[PDB]
Amino acid sequence: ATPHINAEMGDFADVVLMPGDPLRAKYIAETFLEDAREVNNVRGMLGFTGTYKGRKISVMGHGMGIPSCSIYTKELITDFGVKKIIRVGSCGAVLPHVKLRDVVIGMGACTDSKVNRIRFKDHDFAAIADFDMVRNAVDAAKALGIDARVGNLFSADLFYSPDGEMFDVMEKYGILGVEMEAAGIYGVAAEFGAKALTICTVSAHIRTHEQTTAAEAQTTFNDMIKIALESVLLGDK
Amino acid sequence: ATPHINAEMGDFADVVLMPGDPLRAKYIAETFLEDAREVNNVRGMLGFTGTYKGRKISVMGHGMGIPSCSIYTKELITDFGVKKIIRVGSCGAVLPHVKLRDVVIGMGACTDSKVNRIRFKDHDFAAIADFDMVRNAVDAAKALGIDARVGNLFSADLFYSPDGEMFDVMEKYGILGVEMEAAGIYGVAAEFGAKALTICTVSAHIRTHEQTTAAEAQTTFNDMIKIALESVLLGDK
Amino acid sequence: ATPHINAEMGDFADVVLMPGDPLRAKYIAETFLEDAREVNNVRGMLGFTGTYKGRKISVMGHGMGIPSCSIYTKELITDFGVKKIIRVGSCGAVLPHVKLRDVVIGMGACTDSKVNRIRFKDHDFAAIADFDMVRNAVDAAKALGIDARVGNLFSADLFYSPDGEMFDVMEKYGILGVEMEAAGIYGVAAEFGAKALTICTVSAHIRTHEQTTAAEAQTTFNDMIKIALESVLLGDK
Amino acid sequence: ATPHINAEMGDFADVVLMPGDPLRAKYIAETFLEDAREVNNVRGMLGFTGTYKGRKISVMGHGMGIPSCSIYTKELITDFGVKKIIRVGSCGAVLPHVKLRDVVIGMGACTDSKVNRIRFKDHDFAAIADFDMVRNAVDAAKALGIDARVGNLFSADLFYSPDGEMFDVMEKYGILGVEMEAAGIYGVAAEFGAKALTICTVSAHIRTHEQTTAAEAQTTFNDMIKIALESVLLGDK
Amino acid sequence: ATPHINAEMGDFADVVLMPGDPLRAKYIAETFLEDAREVNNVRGMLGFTGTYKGRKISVMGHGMGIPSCSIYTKELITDFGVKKIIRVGSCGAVLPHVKLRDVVIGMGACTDSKVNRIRFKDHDFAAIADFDMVRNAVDAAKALGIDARVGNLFSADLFYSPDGEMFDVMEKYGILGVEMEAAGIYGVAAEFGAKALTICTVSAHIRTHEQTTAAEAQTTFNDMIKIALESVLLGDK
Amino acid sequence: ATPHINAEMGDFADVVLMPGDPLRAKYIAETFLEDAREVNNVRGMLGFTGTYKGRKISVMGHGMGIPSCSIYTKELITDFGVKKIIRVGSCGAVLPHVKLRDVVIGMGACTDSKVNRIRFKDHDFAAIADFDMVRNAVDAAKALGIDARVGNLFSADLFYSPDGEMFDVMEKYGILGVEMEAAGIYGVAAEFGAKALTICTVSAHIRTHEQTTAAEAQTTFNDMIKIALESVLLGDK
Ligand SMILES: Nc1ncnc2c([C@@H]3O[C@H](CO)[C@@H](O)[C@H]3O)n[nH]c12
Ligand SMILES: Nc1ncnc2c([C@@H]3O[C@H](CO)[C@@H](O)[C@H]3O)n[nH]c12
Ligand SMILES: Nc1ncnc2c([C@@H]3O[C@H](CO)[C@@H](O)[C@H]3O)n[nH]c12
Ligand SMILES: Nc1ncnc2c([C@@H]3O[C@H](CO)[C@@H](O)[C@H]3O)n[nH]c12
Ligand SMILES: Nc1ncnc2c([C@@H]3O[C@H](CO)[C@@H](O)[C@H]3O)n[nH]c12
Ligand SMILES: Nc1ncnc2c([C@@H]3O[C@H](CO)[C@@H](O)[C@H]3O)n[nH]c12
């Protein structure tokens, strides 16, 4: 057991899908995994392990924000033998050509957090996903006939940002989705020696104020899950 | 009625106690409140409203880290009429004279987060509690025969810090407890014109690695909750 | 003796009142202290030691700005056994409801100085007063029929700031008064393990230069000094 | 003509290979392009246009450092219709498993430059290559039977860095090569709306002090050129 | 009148000598100026105006630290028509070949203050003296048989710096003297379109507290004042 | 004998003039030196050594930007015994009274580069020229009947800045010319214990868009070179 996960080595697969919402983790386990078993509920942060097409897979929530997901991803990597983390999240769009439910793949993640500056002597660490995992997700999406854009996410510390003008800057620099975790997970993967990828579903448009409901995010973002799971199978080859 | 809280105005009291762990919110409601009812379960972040000695009180988890708790506190203040937030948590000590089970009140909170610099034009915002709430808590503790230390907390972005050296710095500058939320909550309170206070119990000593019993640790945790609840009654005057 | 104070251990009380204007020290000594003796004259920064209602008190100016007051407060603490510093001075207000002649107590002090970032590994140190000293001053003021406001000061490096927009930011975040010392004194207090408090009287509104008649200014100055001195007696407990 | 390029729209292909060394650009044109014509020599920064397997291609030096290459890439994008920039550079390795002449592909680029902070409101911009271009280079290398690692480069402002310890940090974070341009080119591509990729040949090992000669870098780094050119043909499909 | 100087336009010469120690102003006026009249006494910061060899000169102390001297120099320039400020003071040396009683002239001033970053959009402003004033002082010293060193001062915010390692960095980069004002005065001069120079006499080695006899210190002080005054006459040209 | 300079000790004079453009180095050697011979051609960065009025002098391009010129100047100083670097370049003016063809001497150089912060523990290093070289250049200009302005340059990382507002800031703080190298060269000189000076001719006015003739512009450029060469002869004394 670790301070935030009451489980033992072997309870998790070597690949873990991670939504921010533990209820989404529950939905994923019930809907996509066979013979799923709950392996953690410390702090209500539900985690499960089962199989997808014979392949051992885990899914567990990581909570909201870089500091929360940094705890869970670290513990999984250092104490549970986890080799790959695939965040399956939601995000808000700033670009005009992006619609609700669009799937975006974060090859990189910008951020206004200080965590990577703390790691990297106050320089610019380019928080990037593992290339093979990106390519696996792209290929899986194509086989599924699901459109997906690959590019930069922005990982915000403040969902309610006092700096509205920063969204103009994100838009200028082609940011595909604003979420709150990717850059931190990528920093953890590099620090602790594992691999990670974030895929998000657009659940809000920051300009139009169109948005999906909480229930929709919890139980209807199926495209990104299929992409994530099928991408794992590709990586195994 | 917000993306993270499925409740309506009136469902929350004008004061909310907030532990990090939603399971601990349920614990507090069951233990200390009469007629508590669940008012939120989005993302598993349980919230409850009941009464303490006839006074309407809410309790709801805030999740781990500044970004998580910043979402919930903002929404409570702007959308649910909440006037006071009291974070009730655990912290780690760095000072030799601060002991396991000491109760510490964060009149201020240092941080390595960038959120207040973003708010405050890259200058130093002193993230502080509301003075009247601090002295209500000090007085409630005194009435319960519990001494509480008042001073600075440090709100960390990284529970697993790569910078081992920062703990010596915290010790040098007299930090009473290390946690992950206070400076963010204080920043939200200032930004949105509300009042906040963080009280913590020392659950670990980053130095001594001291030991207590579960019974004693749980007693002190309950004492902290009683301090928080009684402090509200004093403020109501 | 120290580089800026020609005195020996014992020449200063364990509590020192510090105005910015060095001319105020002799005034305070003659008007409020009994049996005062001169204990410093280096650079014209006159210091005196006497008693107030039997209690040993010293008074000496600190000069304008963080670097000046940081020198005197450090030397007093490390070489003269001083345990408490009370800065007594003026501030300018940015809040429309904060009035000329209001007494404000800096529980915290924001700043645009780099001194605390230098101390605190470039993170956010919450520069705070000693809580008991704050409460003592609040209680002393109340007994004199004065309602003091407690909250954040802003300690500016530039009295003539080229950033006009910062005053609006200060206002938004509830800053009670703008002065030039508190954050520095609070930083020294934390660095060297002592206790400090800044009390200010509002002498100006930053944006509209209405002023106070000299007679009203002297009356309010005397009130502030009485609050400071009586607060010490309450602290002796 | 632009301030640093004496040519007109149409003189450059829509894809430009860019080594730092204009003499390497000359070598590339002579060795790999047919019917090459010199289209610029302002400041000795030689640029050429010819064909590779029937495909119009340009090659031009960009000079050393982010500020130098930022000028040339900008002008090409805004005034010469250039759509893709492929930097074909040299770099120094910090990882033990990396050898002289190894080819590395920079999907991302870390940096100690301030240029991206200036663009991105002092936040962390993840300076990333275009994904399709990365994938094209990976596929071309595989078809050529040439090994290539994909990951982060570090773009240094100081070839002679006074901070030797930063190399330990780069090594910890898996940096594949230290060069001086990638992060700046990626910033320009995003700012001015084009696509870019940096491929480098390891020409020095920062730990072992093994290094190739100036002449070798000028006229013998053929693997990376073949990869770059063949990757273009893949992208055209 | 201005907030810190009770005088009117014309009361000050267009050139003002400023010692840090306010007691030095009266000394300079009595010892070096003819027909001196008192022109300020606010906060005990005595100012005088007289003539030196027929030329109008004023002298007034500036207090310790950037924030203090920034107030006086700003008011003198904007409200009293002052064109040149010469700070005359002491510094501590870090270079082994810089000796006690050496005269040093700050052509530039490094700093750990944030004031110039606040002015200069967080970039590096090179805080510099007026070149002609520097050369005038060099020439005036030469005519008095004194060889002055010209180079960088370092203007510290903290006389008692917790960063001991910074003195070695200062030494490495050739800093001639450590004081507390020059960078601030130079910043004000640039902001308000005037000219400034800091001249210092070495009174200490930072690392080994050997000192100068009071008689030697007064002799060297007089030499510095004579250099300053004669430099003005050379500047009149 | 270095990766960027194929020459041996003795091939360079102890003073090197450096324009940005290697073709301009060749121009200077042909125009002003006797018996000039090429001593470097690596990366096309032409360098030459010849005599001026019997005095051995070298001239070599430094490329555009701080990172490029930092490589060449460091190597000249540490590997080729060079004692003095004189950058001879062009700059853009922001001040209305600074005119096309004015000669400006950079006694200091501001910058938006991070290189000096990296050197100087993240504080403000005032990047300055060698005082004696500045006054040699001023005197040489006077002897040629050319008035030269001495003050601050601004060394930009981005020739194409996204921050249009910085030019107003440069103007406000009195910057004489905008170029791309001086602060980097001055930082190198300080780091490695050598001496440097940047002289520029105003070739563009970022405001007026003034016009001159090519003949007149080229005359002034040659005057600047003569100032540089004659300044060396004065320093030799
Ligand atoms: N418009 C938006 N802005 C920032 N974060 C999110 C998210 C994700 O959902 C959570 C906040 O709702 C958090 O985990 C974040 O990554 N969905 N939509 C978002
Ligand atoms: N030694 C420590 N360091 C950082 N956070 C905590 C905590 C709290 O518990 C959570 C991390 O376990 C987080 O919400 C924080 O507030 N207890 N002890 C801590
Ligand atoms: N409106 C204002 N802005 C900045 N400082 C002050 C002060 C205090 O007075 C001094 C400036 O005159 C300085 O010591 C500061 O603490 N009073 N009113 C002020
Ligand atoms: N060990 C090293 N460190 C930094 N840059 C380089 C380079 C590249 O070559 C140039 C410096 O030699 C510059 O353009 C840079 O990108 N090769 N080897 C390098
Ligand atoms: N070794 C030293 N370190 C910092 N400042 C000074 C000074 C000057 O004297 C004052 C500090 O005593 C301050 O005004 C500064 O300019 N002399 N010697 C100094
Ligand atoms: N208005 C301007 N802005 C930036 N650099 C320059 C220059 C110089 O010329 C080069 C850029 O063209 C570079 O080396 C710089 O030093 N001339 N005019 C300039």
Numbering used by the authors:
A (entry chain A), B (entry chain D), C (entry chain B), D (entry chain A), E (entry chain B), F (entry chain D): 1 to 237
Give the exact sentences the study uses for this entry:
Purine nucleoside phosphorylase (PNP, purine nucleoside orthophosphate ribosyl transferase, EC 2.4.2.1) has a crucial role in the purine salvage pathway. It catalyses the reversible phosphorolytic cleavage of the glycosidic bond of purine (2′-deoxy) nucleosides, generating the corresponding free base and (2′-deoxy) ribose 1-phosphate. E. coli PNP is an excellent molecular machine conducting efficient catalysis of purine nucleosides glycosidic bond cleavage. It is a homohexamer, built as a trimer of dimers, with all its subunits having the active site in the open conformation in the apo enzyme form. Monomers in each dimer mutually donate two amino acids (His4 and Arg43) to complete their active sites.
Finally, with the highest concentrations of FA used in preparing the complexes, all the sites become occupied with FA molecules, as demonstrated by the electron density in structure DM-6(P/S)-6FA. Here all the sites clearly show the presence of the nucleoside and the refined occupancies of FA molecules are 0.7, 0.5, and 0.6 for chains A, B, and D, respectively. This is the third step in the process of FA binding to the E. coli PNP double mutant, which we could clearly identify by the X-ray crystallography method. It turned out that the conformation of both proteins with all the active sites occupied by both ligands was the same, with a closed conformation in one of three active sites. Both ligands are in the same orientation in the active sites of WT and DM, and the conformation of crucial amino acids is very similar. As already mentioned, amino acids Asp204 and Arg217 are responsible for the protonation of the nucleoside substrate. DM is not able to protonate Ado, hence its catalytic activity (maximal activity of the enzyme in the allosteric model used is 2Vmax2) is about 400-fold lower than that of WT (0.05 U mg−1 and 19.3 U mg−1, respectively).
